[PDB]
Amino acid sequence: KHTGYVGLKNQGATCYMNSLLQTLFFTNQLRKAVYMMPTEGDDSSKSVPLALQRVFYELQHSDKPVGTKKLTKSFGWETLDSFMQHDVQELCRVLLDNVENKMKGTCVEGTIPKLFRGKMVSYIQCKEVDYRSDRREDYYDIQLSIKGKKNIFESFVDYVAVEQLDGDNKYDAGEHGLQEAEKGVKFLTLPPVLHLQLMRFMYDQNIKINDRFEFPEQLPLDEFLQKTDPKDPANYILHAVLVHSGDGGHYVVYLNPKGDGKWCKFDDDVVSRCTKEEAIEHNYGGHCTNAYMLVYIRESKLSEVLQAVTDHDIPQQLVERLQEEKRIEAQK
Numbered sequence: 001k002h003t004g005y006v007g008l009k010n011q012g013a014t015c016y017m018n019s020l021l022q023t024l025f026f027t028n029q030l031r032k033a034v035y036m037m038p039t040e041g042d043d044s045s046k047s048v049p050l051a052l053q054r055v056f057y058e059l060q061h062s063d064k065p066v067g068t069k070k071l072t073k074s075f076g077w078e079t080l081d082s083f084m085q086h087d088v089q090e091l092c093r094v095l096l097d098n099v100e101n102k103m104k105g106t107c108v109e110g111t112i113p114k115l116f117r118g119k120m121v122s123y124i125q126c127k128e129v130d131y132r133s134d135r136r137e138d139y140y141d142i143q144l145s146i147k148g149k150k151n152i153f154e155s156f157v158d159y160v161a162v163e164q165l166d167g168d169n170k171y172d173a174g175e176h177g178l179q180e181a182e183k184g185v186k187f188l189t190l191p192p193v194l195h196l197q198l199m200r201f202m203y204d205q206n207i208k209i210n211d212r213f214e215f216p217e218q219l220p221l222d223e224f225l226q227k228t229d230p231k232d233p234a235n236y237i238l239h240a241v242l243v244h245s246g247d248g249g250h251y252v253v254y255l256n257p258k259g260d261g262k263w264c265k266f267d268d269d270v271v272s273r274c275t276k277e278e279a280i281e282h283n284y285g286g287h288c289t290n291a292y293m294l295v296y297i298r299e300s301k302l303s304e305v306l307q308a309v310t311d312h313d314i315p316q317q318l319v320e321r322l323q324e325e326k327r328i329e330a331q332k
């Protein structure tokens with residue numbers, strides 16, 4: 001085609017599904033691992049793993065907009081409002097949890113963790129009485145506040161900011177009875193691929209915010225870590241920008257698939273090249289087409305994560321099993 005990349009078919013109010021699928025698909029290391037997944041004897045209709053192998057294979061080889069129908073059935077979101085009553089990270093968590101589980105006792109075990117799991121500390125400090133309490137807490141994504149925050153940095157600052165527990169919802173320091181305290185969070189690790197959700201949907205039903213929130217092509221996060229490391233500093237490259245319109249809502253995803261800063265818009269079946277300004281700055285908001293989710297890759301990890309993927313990477317049992325189904329489909 002015009003781009004070398006191909007689109008996905010619209011077959012429902014799947015909303016963010018197509019944006020999310022092309023984002024996962026262009027996370028080449030994830031792709032490679034999905035292809036190695038022992039889906040030999042899987043029921044061809046109820047296996048989320050295989051279904052996703054299908055879509056990836058398809059987006060890699062076909063000239064023709066790919067379809068999602070078997071996948072939507074796969075994981076059982078089939079009602080009118082099933083995608084309207086969840087967010088992206090819930091879908092994402094459904095797809096990755098499936099695939100991480102399938103990948104147990106295999107060559108590719110532990111890929112999803114390695115790609116997207118970071119580590120946070122959650123601490124509670126009482127002011128007067130001396131008592132403190134830390135504990136680790138894994139995350140595969142971050143939800144960042146927007147309202148009243150001008151740019152990413154301000155959202156991070158707000159995330160790791162300390163909060164008080166006075167009067168009404170004091171802290172049970174246990175032996176020490178109710179106590180005034182501060183609780184906060186801090187990062188121990190940031191993963192290779194960093195899924196950040198922007199908090200534009202709030203509740204008399206939920207409404208979409210649309211104010212200006214800015215983010216950069218390059219994101220220094222070292223400041224937000226509990227202890228840094230001058231060998232691998234926490235600098236992220238922007239990889240995808242997932243976007244929505246209105247309240248009436250269109251859903252597109254911008255990508256720079258190779259991390260080289262050459263951008264494409266993915267509007268279902270239409271995939272054109274575009275400027276960095278349409279991808280980035282045009283998605284800030286202001287006074288209502290704008291970004292709800294961002295994917296950043298650590299610069300140290302760019303190459304491994306975006307490693308090149310040929311057709312040799314798909315294995316044989318899969319290729320021929322995928323081949324057959326098209327043929328049975330051809331019988332019509």
Ligand SMILES: C[C@H](Cc1ccccc1)C(=O)N1CCC(O)(Cn2cnc3ccccc3c2=O)CC1
Pocket residue numbers: 015016083084086087088089143197198199200201202207208209244247249292
């Ligand atoms: C249906 C809705 C359309 C939409 C609403 C708000 C902003 C943009 C487009 C849609 O398709 N959504 C997909 C995107 C979200 O997932 C983002 N999101 C995630 N996590 C949160 C956690 C807490 C609070 C708020 C959010 C949030 O807005 C919202 C739902």
